[PDB]
Amino acid sequence: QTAPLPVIFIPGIMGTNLRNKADKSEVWRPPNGLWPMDDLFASIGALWTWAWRGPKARQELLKAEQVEVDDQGTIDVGQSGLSEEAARLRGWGKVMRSAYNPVMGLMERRLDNIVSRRELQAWWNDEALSPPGDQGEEQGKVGPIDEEELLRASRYQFDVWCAGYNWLQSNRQSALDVRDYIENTVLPFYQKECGLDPEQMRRMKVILVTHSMGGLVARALTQLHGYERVLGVVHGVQPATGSSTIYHHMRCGYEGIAQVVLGRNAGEVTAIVANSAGALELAPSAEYREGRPWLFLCDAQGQVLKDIDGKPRAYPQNQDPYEEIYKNTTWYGLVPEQNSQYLDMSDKKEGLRVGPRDNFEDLIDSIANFHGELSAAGYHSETYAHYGADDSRHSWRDLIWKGDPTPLETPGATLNDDENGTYNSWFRRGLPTIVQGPLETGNPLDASGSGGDETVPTDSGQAPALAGVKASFRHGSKGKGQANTKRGYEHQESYNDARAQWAALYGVIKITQLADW
């Protein structure tokens, strides 16, 4: 030694602090929701970055091309053994503290303490040795960690670096930014610190550990470019094929329980999300749910309605959510006509250089192309994935409009919803209303994809397993194993659950067996 082996943590949805690129003021520093109002300074952060920003201001300030990562957030070094200054250099102040600092510090201390004085240290000597099946592993290929493997792993010095990224921009571009971070910040630290010559540098490898949409960033990085620098990948709660929740949020606002939000009604969320490639890329792909519908128009009895051709109003009907839902401007579309006003609030359409709908449709075509490339390119060959699959977290998995669409669909349709989930008003009743699933009468093929982790339906969480990744841990009620009996974890806080932590450390140990030395 030294034989450094950097662990690069890539955060997820809305997970990285942002500042305005020109003026450097803070524009994003989560959490910004009504939950959890449990910390005074946290609430100041939300007031300053979000609460006092008007709708037009928010649309201007949360603009992908006009923001950049802000590494000056608060840091909880916990039991990592790092000074705040060191953790700051490692970028830990780039990301939501409660969601990510604990797991980064845990991995740091655990990986810095595998073997001492020819004994396995705490946790590694018992908990780590669990049969993967006990932890909900479903592929059945990988085996338990053994003493050899830990001794081998202990020969390396692991350090956790935090690859925060501009989540508003396309994950395609964020992959490039993460590459630059590794090649231009992380590795040069070791070049200087360890006095490494260029060959030694070239031989260095890193391990990615991702949360949520950070997994799409990672796949873009390793699968759409030649980036052999990455030895292996751990994914936690990746929405591999997207999430129907984006439809709920764009049509209804985020729910009051959400820690991180982009608005409390349709117009607020739509104003930001519909202009952001990174945000829109969370939308379900054509392959989501194996091409089956997720958006259901049902009657008062919960039965799926019939369209003009007598076919079920269950969308997508022909495996094209982009045209059938996302660009559809009718009442059930992602951005119905009533919500066009939110696409660009800067001025009346007339004097603008770009039409709001022109921009939006091109952005949808862009995500369709990115989705398609990612699907074809698959997953790193050494991928260890874990996800929350629990039927006690409905996760908007079935997006259901329940009610009578008739009055909405007569020629010259003008009816508007309340931007919070219903067309019912003082003036009209029995009309379509978004209601919690699951669907009354389900497709038997849909059984395995129900529930989720609140944000990622199991449909999407289990996609990596279906695509044949090396290891996949199905956590929660829909999985198995004696160490997997607790209720499945929630998305935002997943890395604070013992199972997510176990699966991450397990992945790192297994991937490390591939390291040369």
């Binding site: 003026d23 300053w48 008007g54 004097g351 250089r353």
Partner: protein, 301 residues
């Protein structure tokens, strides 16, 4: 407050005074896209533009062929590179415009998306920009109407969508940041009505939170309102001071205007409570009032 040595700055249509040691970062945006000041000398600019055109010419749309569409001459030595906005775009271009001030040369990049069916209109805007971009010394206050940016101003008083944001730190007040923004168009709601719920939530939840001030704060003919809060936890004090003029539609001199001063959580230095941003709430309010009360539309002819 003693404003000895304070500097009057031009931002967009407005003036504001800041302490001489203030560290200032500014951005300016036209029709929603940043107009970026470049350090380029003329030969460097030429090479920059040619370099980009040739890069674009190597790139391929997924179905429409060359990603590069055309180089446009906007007159007044200003040029634009027009490309597809992505490799699958069909309705929008990227128009990357380079423009110089006169008569003193300074270079700017102003890049953004343009609709295919709005191309001629976009061209006229860039033509007009190149006619109107006037140089000024860094602290020169123009008496002619126009929108001030780095080293220049966009002359005229015809309506256009325009915005700035300026961020300021103060050596003497570690942890503090002031920001000043203007944006054409009325904000959709008003400041006090907007934030009160959240603030009342903060006050109710945290005994360490307090409201220092809430109400009207006109500055000359600017009908501003403000909401000022502060709080203590972990042995440090935070602040969030908020000021806004809602704005009027299609108005260059009555746009939405905000001013804000924050002290967010900072850390202990080696296990010691972070160094205070201000000596007292009174000191913070003094700085706040002094800056905000200096905000005014730039007098012009």
């Amino acid at each position: 407050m003693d404003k000895t040595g304070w500097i009057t700055h031009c931002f967009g249509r407005f003036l504001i005074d800041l302490p001489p040691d203030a560290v200032i970062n500014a951005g300016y945006y036209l029709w929603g896209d940043r107009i970026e000041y470049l350090d380029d000398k003329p030969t460097e600019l030429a090479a920059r533009v040619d370099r980009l055109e040739q890069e674009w010419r190597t790139q391929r749309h997924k179905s429409k062929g060359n990603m590069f569409l055309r180089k446009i001459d906007f007159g007044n030595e200003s040029v634009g590179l027009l490309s597809w906005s992505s490799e699958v775009a069909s309705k929008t271009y990227l128009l990357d415009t380079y423009v110089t001030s006169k008569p003193t040369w300074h270079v700017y990049r102003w890049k953004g998306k343009v609709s295919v069916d709005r191309e001629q209109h976009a061209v006229e805007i860039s033509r007009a920009l190149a006619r109107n971009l006037r140089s000024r010394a860094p602290k020169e206050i123009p008496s002619e109407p126009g929108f001030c940016i780095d080293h220049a101003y966009i002359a005229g008083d015809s309506f256009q969508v325009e915005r700035f944001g300026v961020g300021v730190t103060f050596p003497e007040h570690p942890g503090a940041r002031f920001e000043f923004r203007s944006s054409t168009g009325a904000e959709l709601n008003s400041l006090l009505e907007r934030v009160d719920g959240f603030v009342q939530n903060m006050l109710s939840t945290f005994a360490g939170m307090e409201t220092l001030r809430k109400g009207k704060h006109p500055v000359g003919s600017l009908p501003g309102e403000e909401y000022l809060v502060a709080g203590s936890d972990k042995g440090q004090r935070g602040y969030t001071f908020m000021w806004e003029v809602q704005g009027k539609e299609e108005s260059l001199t009555e746009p939405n205007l905000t001013a804000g001063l924050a002290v967010l959580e900072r850390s202990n230095e080696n296990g010691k409570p972070p160094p205070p941003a201000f000596k007292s709430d009174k000191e913070a309010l003094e700085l706040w009032d002094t800056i905000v009360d200096s905000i005014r539309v730039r007098p012009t002819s």
